[PDB]
Design a protein around this ligand. Structure first.
Ligand SMILES: COc1cc(Nc2cc(-n3c(C)cc4c3CC(C)(C)CC4=O)ccc2C(N)=O)cc(OC)c1OC
Length: 209
């Protein structure tokens, strides 16, 4: 069973701006998604200090970047806190609404899209490079879910029947036809070094084939 939901107006607006605005510095999407992963990893790590059993679903705290040229996808995988159904549908969206408002005000005042992260809505920078984003996530004490959106004002959530993840999140970027450079090892290495060099978790760039 697949449930379909409408984005709140502000998020739909944000996604349209990201998709429609001419802005060449698209590579910033990667640091934003890695920053989401890092924050998620911080969260499970801190929680585990008071409840060590929260790591029964996996001790290792890390990030993998997986390019797939056949599928034309770049996947960002982490073993962070993951997201409940409520996190996916309601709660992160509520925070993103107020973040969007501040971001759009800042843009009018002369800020640029690369500053999106300061407003807590950096996830949506995925749409600079992706025609569709799929999010597979597993939080402790909840089911594995798949969230998906190609924008257009709606997203879906279903319970996932793919490979079980233990705990964490996979963000699968179905890349735009003209954005396949982000499948190249050298290009990913370049971006991580430039923007994500001090992330406090191992980042493994998988190689193709
Ligand atoms: C930044 O803080 C947090 C991030 C996350 N996780 C994440 C959240 C997002 N994220 C954020 C910040 C906003 C949004 C998302 C993903 C979405 C599909 C729910 C759409 C959205 O509006 C993306 C990736 C992860 C990830 N890699 O785990 C979970 C949290 O707690 C369950 C949390 O603490 C509030």
């Amino acid at each position: 069973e697949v449930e379909t939901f409408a984005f709140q107006a502000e998020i739909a607006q944000l996604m349209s701006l990201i998709i429609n605005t001419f802005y060449s510095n698209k590579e910033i999407f990667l640091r934003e998604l890695i920053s989401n992963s890092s924050d998620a990893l911080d969260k499970i790590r801190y929680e585990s200090l008071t409840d060590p059993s929260k790591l029964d679903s996996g001790k290792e705290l890390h990030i993998n970047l997986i390019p797939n040229k056949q599928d034309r996808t770049l996947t960002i995988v982490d073993t962070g806190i993951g997201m409940t159904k409520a996190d996916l549908i309601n709660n992160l969206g509520t925070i993103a609404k107020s973040g969007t408002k501040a971001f759009m005000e800042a843009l009018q005042a002369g800020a640029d899209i690369s500053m999106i992260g300061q407003f807590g809505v950096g996830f949506y920078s995925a749409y600079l490079v992706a025609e569709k984003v799929t999010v597979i996530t597993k939080h402790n004490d909840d089911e594995q879910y798949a969230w998906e959106s190609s924008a257009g004002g709606s997203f879906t959530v279903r319970t996932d029947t793919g490979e079980p993840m233990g705990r964490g999140t996979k963000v699968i970027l179905h890349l735009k036809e003209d954005q396949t450079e982000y499948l190249e090892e050298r290009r990913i290495k370049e971006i991580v070094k430039k923007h994500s060099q001090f992330i406090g978790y191992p980042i493994t760039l998988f190689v193709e084939k």
